[PDB]
């Protein structure tokens, strides 16, 4: 059998795992941060302007973790390491 | 040897296949329900101590009417009360008839049931769910108009989520059917699996599972009726 | 095979359900609603009769 | 046969459980509702009789 | 064995992983954001509209991740990278 | 060996992953939203109605993902992409 | 070897994934809904009656996914699509 | 290569997935319901009995799923569907 | 390719999944129940006495789910069903 | 292929699953118990002394499962059941 | 066939698992910490600065794990241990 | 086909699972502990120095598990038990 076929199948499975984990983390973290933001804004309108500052920071640390994973999937699927 | 599916009494008519076992189970459930209804009609009294059947029927009616009032005024949707009562009683009787000891050996080591809960057949759940679907969509059309109703269901509470709303409309019927089916179908497997134990061990797991399945069927009937009521409430508004 | 495929059974089941619905729609729910309404009216009448007995006794004592 | 015997024993256990620990409370609830309805009907009867007595008193005075 | 078949099976498994992770993230994040919205509306009804701006931001950030996964799922499934 | 067999096994595993993820997300998100609704009703019995509008705005979204996954799962198994 | 053997192994693994995901979602969502119910009853112990309706709505929504997954697992394992 | 060997391996993996998912769901749901029960008993000791009615319902709804999974796991290992 | 070898590998993978799921469920459920217990004791120091009653129930309902998995794991790897 | 090779690969994957599940459960349960402990100490600083008895119990349960898993991992990896 | 093919496929799958777990953990932990930060800032607007010192610590720890995983994934993917 | 190839691939997948589980557990546990720390410091600013003792315990335990997994991962990938 062709080694490239097995390597490509493994790379695709690995990229799928990478994006599955990244999406789980991004979705749940964004949901939790948004829950905090919504509760804060419900508590008092005046906080809306202020609370958006920490919120983005949270979304900065969450979404970033996602996109890194995204980038690596490209490496897995588009330029597969050890493709032989 | 689970023997999943394998409907008995299957027959042919008008170039269509009919599962005789499901028809027989549904007919038995309908006979029980109609007998209870006519016993009520015979023993219904407003100026005397109510009988057990009257108490049961009026308890169901009061529960369903309370649900309707909570969701949508009984003035707006009177028919929802009989529809929900019928759905609840039908499902409850069909599920509870499965507690009777009508399972035996199939002469090949596989368990065979004289009476299987009709909700274990996809046709039964599909009939119920599709009837509810058409009924509440027709109610929505009546309340909103032929053109207004589809616009309102597509728009939903927030307009820009129109795609999601559409999926939600398709999610209502399927979830009504499969859910029921699933929770009954799984049960049918359980008993069959429990039938693989020796007679001196089969009784205990069978007893526990069927005792819990009574409550499971009651809960499923209540959930089906309540979801039907609130789907009607959502369809009929504004 | 594929026990999950919808069959003609569907129609049959529907018909049976419809029949039951009719029996419920005509001979179960209307009588039960009438019974409940009559019971509630009886309770309201009892309360009103108690109040009217009280007020009539008071008026007889006063006048 | 063996399956039938096992499931019949299981049904016997189910019936025992239902009779011992389910029938009593549900029958108590049914009896309570029946007693409530009977008491309501009675209370209506004595209320009507009391109103009749009050009307008789008013007519007398 | 046809190498294309191995690559296709790997791509299908990877796309399944992508969709599973995306669905988990979307469902849980939207549930959490909706919990926040429902709690805010219950605490004070007048805030309903005031709470839609942050809530839909959260659902905007969650769903977006899901959508991205979906897109790449297509890439995995319909135009499989490395499919020789 | 039949390549279609490998492709079909991969498609079945992928659809299984899709449904597992969709089920996890839907169940947990619906549970969270229902927790919010139940708490709101317990604290404010009069809210019974006014809390359904946000609740079903949440549940809808939570269900959407699930059923979207369902569609793709069917596409995975009933009309398998890449199946020769 | 027999293609049906590989197809059946894949179908069994996919059904296992379906049922595992459904069980996780159902268990966690039912636990969360029951937590809401128990907390609401603890707060005001005479609200038992009025909370059971929303609790059972939540339970129905949560079990929808579980039992849809159960039905589709039954489809996978008992009438396997694409089974040669 | 006996096809039954592959089918049995797939059945074992699927049953393991079913049991793992059921265990996760049951454990976490029971933990959450018990958390609610403990908090309620701490807050309102005299509501103990009142709090046991919902708790045992939640467990009943949760544990049941577990056992259902358990049953199907047996169906996978002891009554493997599709076995040749 | 000994059939027993493939069956044993599948059994080991299934038992590993069973134990992983059981461990996740047990750890998280016990942690949540202990969180409830710790909070209750912190707020009501004298409540400890009674709080051990529900706690032991919750743990009993969680550890049980764990110790069942154990048993079936011991069944998967020591007396493998379907082995020949 | 060597039967022992396949058996050992399956055992390694199973042990990896065991340790992954144990690690997830241990980490999350310990985090939750520590959250309870920290919240209790913050609310009432002097309660620390009496908060360790329940905390140690909670962790004691959690770690137990994890360590149990560890043991079986060794059994899977160092004395593989069913090894030929 | 080529040993390096199987080894590289396994290495890619392992790296994908490592990044999936790291992304899940990072996303969820960062979301939780950011939720705490947002709630603290909302309740106490004058605590803006004081809550960065703990929050960063938490983020640090969380990020640590993620990045550590990343390193090992590179070790898995670019310089595969045991490659031969 | 060298059996060492299969064993190495299995060991790589097992180590990936170990690290993924460890990362998930560590990230989520550290996030939860940091949430508790941030909330406590916001509530009781003067309690900061006092809250770091329990916190460092929690993280400790969490980290412990993570690191243990890492160690065993090094055992899986570098000195693989069962090579032959
Ligand atoms: C509206 O919500 C969205 N908001 C977004 C927000 C930001 C970004 Br950047 C992308 C977004 C993308 C979308 C949807 C979308 C709408 C239309 C076309 C494409 C994508 C969505 O992705 C939502 C899926 N969710 C609910 C799990 C969707 C995908 C696939 C099938 C759908 C079927 C029905 C409804 C929505 C469907």
Numbering used by the authors:
A (entry chain O), E (entry chain N), F (entry chain M), G (entry chain L), H (entry chain T), I (entry chain S), ...: 3 to 86
B (entry chain a): 10 to 247
C (entry chain b): 22 to 84
D (entry chain d): 1 to 61
From the paper:
The membrane domain of the mycobacterial ATP synthase is embedded in the IPM, with the catalytic F1-domain of the enzyme extending into the bacterial cytoplasm and attached to the membrane domain by a central stalk and a peripheral stalk (PS). As do other ATP synthases in eubacteria, chloroplasts, and mitochondria, the enzyme couples a proton-motive force (pmf) across the IPM generated by respiration to the synthesis in the F1-domain of the enzyme of ATP from adenosine diphosphate (ADP) and phosphate by a mechanical rotary mechanism. The mycobacterial rotor consists of a membrane-bound ring of nine c-subunits, attached to an elongated central stalk, made of single copies of the γ- and ε-subunits. The mycobacterial PS is made of two proteins, bδ and b′.
One major difference is that in the prior study BD was well-resolved bound to the c9-ring at the interface with the a-subunit. In the current study, the concentration of BD employed was almost an order of magnitude lower (25 μM instead of 200 μM), and this lower concentration proved to be suboptimal for the detection of the BD itself, as the drug was present in only a minority of particles. Therefore, in the various states and substates (see below) the density for BD is highly variable. However, in the current work, by combining the membrane domains of all of the particles, bound BD could be modeled in the same position as previously reported in close proximity to the N-terminal region of aH5 of the c-subunit in a position that would inhibit ATP synthesis. This position is the “lagging” site. In some reconstructions, partial nonprotein densities were observed at the opposite side of the a–c interface in close proximity to the C-terminal region of aH5 as in the prior publication. However, the densities were poorly defined and it would be tenuous, in the absence of previously published results, to assign them definitively as BD molecules.
